[PDB]
Amino acid sequence: TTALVCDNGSGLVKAGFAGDDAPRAVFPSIVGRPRHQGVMVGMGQKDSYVGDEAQSKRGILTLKYPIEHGIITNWDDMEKIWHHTFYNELRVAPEEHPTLLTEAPLNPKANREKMTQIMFETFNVPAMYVAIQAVLSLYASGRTTGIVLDSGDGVTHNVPIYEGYALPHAIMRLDLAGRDLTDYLMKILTERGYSFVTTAEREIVRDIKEKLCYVALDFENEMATAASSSSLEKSYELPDGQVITIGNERFRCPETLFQPSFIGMESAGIHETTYNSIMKCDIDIRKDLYANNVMSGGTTMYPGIADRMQKEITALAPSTMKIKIIAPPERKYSVWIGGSILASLSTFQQMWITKQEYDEAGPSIVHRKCF
Amino acid sequence: TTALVCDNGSGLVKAGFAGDDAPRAVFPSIVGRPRHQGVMVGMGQKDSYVGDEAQSKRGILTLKYPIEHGIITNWDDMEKIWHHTFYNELRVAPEEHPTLLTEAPLNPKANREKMTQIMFETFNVPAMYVAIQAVLSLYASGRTTGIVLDSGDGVTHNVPIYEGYALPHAIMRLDLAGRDLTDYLMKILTERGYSFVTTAEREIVRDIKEKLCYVALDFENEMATAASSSSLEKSYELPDGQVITIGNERFRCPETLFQPSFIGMESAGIHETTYNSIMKCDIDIRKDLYANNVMSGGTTMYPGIADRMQKEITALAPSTMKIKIIAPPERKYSVWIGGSILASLSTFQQMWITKQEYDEAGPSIVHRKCF
Amino acid sequence: TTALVCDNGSGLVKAGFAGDDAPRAVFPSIVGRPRHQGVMVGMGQKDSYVGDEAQSKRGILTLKYPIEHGIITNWDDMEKIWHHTFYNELRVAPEEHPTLLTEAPLNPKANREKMTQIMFETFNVPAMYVAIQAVLSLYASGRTTGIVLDSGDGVTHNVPIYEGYALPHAIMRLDLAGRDLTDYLMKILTERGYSFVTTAEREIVRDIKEKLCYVALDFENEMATAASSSSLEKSYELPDGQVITIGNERFRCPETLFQPSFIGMESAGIHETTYNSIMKCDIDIRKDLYANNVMSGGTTMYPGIADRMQKEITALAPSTMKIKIIAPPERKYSVWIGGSILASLSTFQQMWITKQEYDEAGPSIVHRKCF
Amino acid sequence: TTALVCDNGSGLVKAGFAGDDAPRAVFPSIVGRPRHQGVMVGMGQKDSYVGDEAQSKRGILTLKYPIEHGIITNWDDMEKIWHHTFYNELRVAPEEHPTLLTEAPLNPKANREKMTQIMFETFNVPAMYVAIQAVLSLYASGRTTGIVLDSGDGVTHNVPIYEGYALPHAIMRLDLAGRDLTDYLMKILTERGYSFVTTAEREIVRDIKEKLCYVALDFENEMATAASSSSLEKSYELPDGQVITIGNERFRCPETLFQPSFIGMESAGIHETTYNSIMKCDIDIRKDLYANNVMSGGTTMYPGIADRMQKEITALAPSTMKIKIIAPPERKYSVWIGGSILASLSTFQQMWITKQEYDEAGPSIVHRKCF
Amino acid sequence: TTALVCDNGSGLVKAGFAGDDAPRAVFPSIVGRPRHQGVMVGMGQKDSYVGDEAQSKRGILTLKYPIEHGIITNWDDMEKIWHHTFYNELRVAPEEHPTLLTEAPLNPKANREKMTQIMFETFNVPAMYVAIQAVLSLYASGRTTGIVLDSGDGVTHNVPIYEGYALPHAIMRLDLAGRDLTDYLMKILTERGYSFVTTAEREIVRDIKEKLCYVALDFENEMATAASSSSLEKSYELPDGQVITIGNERFRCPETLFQPSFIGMESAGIHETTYNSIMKCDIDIRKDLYANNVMSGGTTMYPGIADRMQKEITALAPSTMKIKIIAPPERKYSVWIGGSILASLSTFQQMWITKQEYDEAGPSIVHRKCF
Ligand SMILES: Nc1ncnc2c1ncn2[C@@H]1O[C@H](COP(=O)(O)OP(=O)(O)O)[C@@H](O)[C@H]1O
Ligand SMILES: Nc1ncnc2c1ncn2[C@@H]1O[C@H](COP(=O)(O)OP(=O)(O)O)[C@@H](O)[C@H]1O
Ligand SMILES: Nc1ncnc2c1ncn2[C@@H]1O[C@H](COP(=O)(O)OP(=O)(O)O)[C@@H](O)[C@H]1O
Ligand SMILES: Nc1ncnc2c1ncn2[C@@H]1O[C@H](COP(=O)(O)OP(=O)(O)O)[C@@H](O)[C@H]1O
Ligand SMILES: Nc1ncnc2c1ncn2[C@@H]1O[C@H](COP(=O)(O)OP(=O)(O)O)[C@@H](O)[C@H]1O
Ligand SMILES: [Mg+2]
Ligand SMILES: [Mg+2]
Ligand SMILES: [Mg+2]
Ligand SMILES: [Mg+2]
Ligand SMILES: [Mg+2]
């Protein structure tokens, strides 16, 4: 039979079937609830809205994200979202399709324990498996060597792999991703007089960010150019017809990835994190790691991010080494693509967590069965 | 020489001289214009009235506030008010006294740019400086550690400071202040048959609010007590001799600070905003922030507001931490007091924005010179 | 006159006077610098903090260790720390007191060359000397026979001595010490949901480790016991009032000493290193080495480390030999104690590196004068 | 038919066919096993790697040498290496080719007994023979008189032969060879800040040693020259792009052959060992031994070793005697060359240990059949 | 007064006083010097160790024998040993006690000349005398007829005496003694995997030899028995706790006395040497020589040596003659016993070499005064 692949990200939900080349269902990972009082009678109004329906009537709802920083904080909302994916989007019965789930490294173990418990108790999937997203990204890339820089909506992590062997002591994690960039853009848009406060306005700011932001090759020169001329200014139209203009905020927002101190964080940029992860590996494998930098996730879709990353890593690495940044045009769904590839493998079918094993071993089977 | 300190708030204007302990001039920040047709000849009537004069003949004028939400919307009226303060109230020549101005955080930059331009072009002040009101409140408090909750007439903001170092990523702003409370009281007074519509009636309602309103320690119990008995009812006399009676509207109006949903806002209460600002700071400085909650502004003068804030924050913070709310009896003028203290410092005299620097660097000198 | 003894470790600084039985000054070897922007004026804030002062205001500073793995990487910070020790802690003038310094074996020679250059040029000490820390530990033990296992914050080394004669071909070194254990504990605390990232949080994790960790006599049995029951779980209170609970991480962290593969190292455990060092010595001196195992350093202060070491070495050594582990209660300062003992010897005064010898022979005099 | 010649050294394996002038297969004598955890599925990864394959993926493996000091310590690994040589390198069937093996003198007898047992039981060679490596070196030299100084990777031995007659009472052995030199170079490279610890780093250090080391004609003068000038310094590039610089360590490493006390050994140098072996022979044969010093093995390939040996022996021997050191350019494979020559002799075919003799006489036939 | 008797052997020193029945001081004839570098200060370490003190700290010293083959090769070490005997062992003043010394026959004359010169110049003995050790052995035996077979540590000699008359043309000498046996045992212990190389390991091997070796009555039958069964195998415990097992090496080592070709010597066995010495005497004295074979020295203390000697000589001598081997249980000190007996004789006091005779006749007086 066919197996389901679900990539439960912080912001988006990517669901589909193993063997396909693109997710069947992609929609925001939000749940909305009304915040006003209803006066019409017989409208058949619901008490909650999930996905694109919540984004539709977002002017009267309060939107909540069940996942923050790759960690599920609301489990009732997560069950609602999983039910939505399984019934109203994929339109399948989760009793005959094994389901493949993803998770960021260095997460709490209770997260995956509860994921397995919900999958086997609330739903009746015959088997399930939890895979590291960077491994799936490297599967999608078609290679078995390289360090993967995955940046989605909640977390950013690096995982180096040499010959199918992972070096877990060199895995580095960062709680700086797209949502922090959206909040920073919201904060810095107030300098021009634009005030976005509500969650619906947060969605507006997210759309502005993902439609008008880019990474500058040289930050100081770009700031000087923006200050001098006005060619970098762009206009955006609000839903009510108002037009706002954005100048240096276009590239000041993605700059937080390379200078996390813009949002009060002491951590290092993504380039320095990648270099530190590489330098924690064996000296004989560093050359192949320098030439196989793989990027994945929505936050890696900014224009000019790959060139900036290559420039920074070249400035860090020695001159003799060759630095290659591998950013496929479909890296926004590379985790799901690799998950589908892994679930479609003939030799992978012996590593599913079957129902009998879960019943005999409790929810702790996931730790020993899954890396 | 002596330097001027001007606290241009949304509702009130606090002006005076550095080194004093109280503002010299305090008057409403309104400009009035006649709305009827004159029949007497030779009365020497003016076309505009500023300050207490407008409040005197408010039965024949239309009153306008030049500032909404800490942002100056009318600049001709603001110039009129500044001229009033400099000539008819302080009775000084603004050419030999440096002037210290205040501004709320996260305001548009054009606001302070135009403030500097007006101060250096319309008037001829030798130097000027713009300071954050929360920093001045902490100066007045006599301490260099703590989170300040300033609530005036247009805005409410929180600014945490540990050892003279501000954490700008933890600053939170709220466009809910005294004017919204006055509008809400006007709206809810119609339930008893009292209809106030005009701007002069808005001043009447503001006086009723600031003379008869208080914050309830427990809102539901207070509502039950008001419904059961009649001891909470108070009487107010209108200018024409009519007497109105107010019941649960006395504490239903200030409750909007802790439940902003009463006026259709999705934001969180002041207690939750303070807790969120504290939790955005470093873990090693949170203990000193919990014990140094400083309140300032006119909107913090409601009876029982400090006890309610302490109760809510204690309910939010862990049991081991000690919560102290610092509400001095003179917190209505603490911003001006701190501004005077800062302007009277010997080591502060090197940070004035002199006329030559403004001339060479344009109106953009304020951003680099002032935090 | 009196001579100074300074034990410049990776984590701690132990300074004092020769002839005493305890260091006069002990404080962390860190330098902190502000990472936020200051708003108060006239606070007299400094640009750097050294020692306990940095640990005080660690919520607003970035902390750096000038020494990694017993090698000084930052020399300006090291000069700052030495100035701190000489002036603000010992309160003496380093021009009439000869200073005794310590260093780990198999260090770069430029390290001690620059140490001598700084001591004779930046300061004006009349004489100085560099001693191996294991020799000082054996001096403190009061015996002249035995192999010393010194483990501080950056390095772990073994040095066997028979009759005052060292066997340098049997000296073994290991770059696994307390800082690696702190990093491993930080990494494995994320499994329970606790995220410590900043340097101040690194200090928090170090305190948790040194107040709640121990060495298990049998690792697998301890893991089984921790999995079955909950008697091994302990609670710790964070500075902000939050309480965290630690289970098997209490003994999983010190286990890295005996199984260095937990942090991706191919090296052997401390017991195997000690056995290999003993087996590299002459057959006629091995019996006295088996019965004189001396431990020193802070990393040797874990509960149950001595019993585990004895058990492992007994399992390695032949049955007839007698294994004794000598772990005095004051082994945390045994290097300093032995240095004081050596500096107080009457027959040692002829081996100081005087100023004239340094002037005539350059900084290379340390190699020929010191072992 | 053709007979196989296998020179199982400590570091290298030299295999081929009798009658040829060069070994067919030369590769390191190592077996590698993974030390990390695999995450890719379907890679077809092996559990062990032998030879150059282990040297390829050495950044993720732990490398072990089955032979130390000419003595086989691991027999499963030795069987793996023999299978590799017989199948993946020579690509022959070891059932119709008699195999000639080599062994150092004064080895344990169980070593050759087990070699014969493995050759006749695990494989089915029709016949086999064990020859002394010095005799094969003298065969390759084309002469039947002289003392042979063979130094490979584990052992160094001297064997004097006059007219085809060996003097076994004058054979001298030394457990100081290339591996000790590699370990010493690793130890003394830490003085410049370079730290090599892992087995792969041991291979790196071995490459540095065999590409940058030489024997100084006069050690003290060379040390003075290296200290004074900098013309003796050379640079080496690490696999990750880092560049290291080596000074007097180039000739300080090979000096251990003439001064074994550098690594804590009480033995005498190779020159003194050769002189002592010569002086243990009859007085009438010493003159021909002085003029037929033959060197063999990889450790004899250092530049300037032959001149130094001649100088030392001339200083030891009387003035009238003539000292000649015979170091052919192909002495790295002279043992294999002599073994091929011996196996290709028509008169040697009667001294093979046939299968019937082994079956009737047990594994002890090797002692009586082979010298 | 009392006279001193000193038996300066190759391995042992036997000193005492004339008239006693056992030597007062017996200790090894070695001098040790440190070979490592000292790190402790104030240990009062010496630069040389003599006797049992050298055997104590032999794991850090290099041991040298001043005497090889009964010939003194190092004279500074010999002076050190003589000073040790005279002061730290006998505790007497060598100025009032005449000293009796011993020497092997057919030694260089310069040996005894320098012995006399040292005794009369470095020390101030009133008189001295050099006696042949075989004559002293025959004195100890209490008879004046017979051939003496003395075998110590360096030499083996035969001296036949008939009626107090020596036949110097029949004296035979052999440079095969205990030290050669120790070296042979060291060489043949490598066949079982035991490697002893250092001088301290030479002492270990000497102890093993003198505690586990014996002479086989029939060598070939003993070899067959050892090969067949395992009852001849014995175990020995090394100082570090390791246990070694010795089989046919127990009797293969003493066999070198009867088959000197085992160590590459062309000479004849001790039995054949004794027979040849007897056959060089007059035919009328051979019968009394056949029946008075006297053995002395440590090398004659092997079990079964006397029976083997009797069997061999009986096989050589004609059937009618009666062969008696006289091996007293105290033959290890028979030379010293006979020297004491000779020095205690009243009629011997006229043959001392007085100081005046030495002064007038130079060091050559010993040749004419002593046989
Ligand atoms: N073209 C784009 N440019 C910049 N940011 C983008 C773009 N597309 C998506 N993003 C950001 O990436 C995030 C989605 O990343 P995704 O890979 O779905 O994360 P997750 O794996 O956690 O679901 C969104 O928050 C969005 O703001
Ligand atoms: N005693 C009081 N009780 C309740 N509200 C008050 C009281 N005094 C003043 N206010 C309110 O506070 C506002 C003035 O606050 P102020 O600090 O002057 O604001 P700003 O700093 O913007 O001028 C007025 O709108 C008034 O309604
Ligand atoms: N009681 C304890 N238990 C476990 N670890 C400890 C204890 N006390 C100190 N340590 C660790 O030992 C280190 C200090 O060791 P120290 O001997 O000062 O090293 P150094 O000689 O390099 O200064 C610290 O990093 C600390 O984490
Ligand atoms: N050109 C060279 N210079 C110095 N050392 C070398 C050189 N070539 C090889 N070696 C050393 O010699 C050793 C190989 O010697 P080899 O004769 O193969 O020993 P074996 O007979 O035990 O296999 C290696 O360990 C290597 O370090
Ligand atoms: N019981 C014994 N069995 C075998 N050999 C012995 C025994 N006792 C001593 N020896 C050997 O005899 C030697 C000592 O002989 P000794 O008579 O002291 O010689 P010397 O007269 O030259 O000092 C030692 O080298 C020792 O190895
Ligand atoms: Mg994702
Ligand atoms: Mg204000
Ligand atoms: Mg230390
Ligand atoms: Mg070889
Ligand atoms: Mg003797």
Author numbering:
A (entry chain E), B (entry chain C), C (entry chain B), D (entry chain D), E (entry chain A): 5 to 375
Reproduce, without paraphrasing, sentences from the article in which this PDB structure was first reported.
The motor protein myosin-15 is necessary for the development and maintenance of mechanosensory stereocilia, and mutations in myosin-15 cause hereditary deafness. Unconventional myosin-15 (encoded by the Myo15a gene in mouse and MYO15A in humans) is a plus-end directed molecular motor essential for stereocilia development and maintenance. Here, we present cryo–electron microscopy structures of myosin-15 bound to F-actin, providing a framework for interpreting the impacts of deafness mutations on motor activity and actin nucleation.
Several recent high-resolution cryo-EM studies of F-actin have indicated that the D-loop is structurally dynamic within the context of the filament. Our F-actin alone structure reveals a region of the D-loop (residues G48-Q49) that is structurally flexible but nevertheless primarily adopts a mixture of two conformations. At a high threshold (0.036 RMS), our map of bare F-actin features ambiguity surrounding residues G48 and Q49, despite clear density for all other residues in the D-loop. On the basis of the respective strengths of the two density paths, the Out conformation is predominant in the bare F-actin structure, likely stabilized by an interaction between the side chain of Q49 of subunit i + 2 and the side chain of Y169 from the adjacent subunit i. Class 3, corresponding to 19.5% of the particles, instead showed discontinuous density for the main chain spanning G48 and Q49 at a high threshold (0.018 RMS). In contrast to the predominant Out conformation in classes 1, 2, and 4, the density for the In conformation is moderately stronger than the Out conformation in class 3, implying that the D-loop still represents a mixture of states but preferably assumes the In conformation. This analysis further supports a model in which the D-loop of bare F-actin dynamically samples two conformations, with the Out conformation being predominant. The data we present here reveal the closed D-loop conformation in ADP F-actin to be a mixture of In and Out states whose occupancy can be manipulated by myosin-15 engagement.
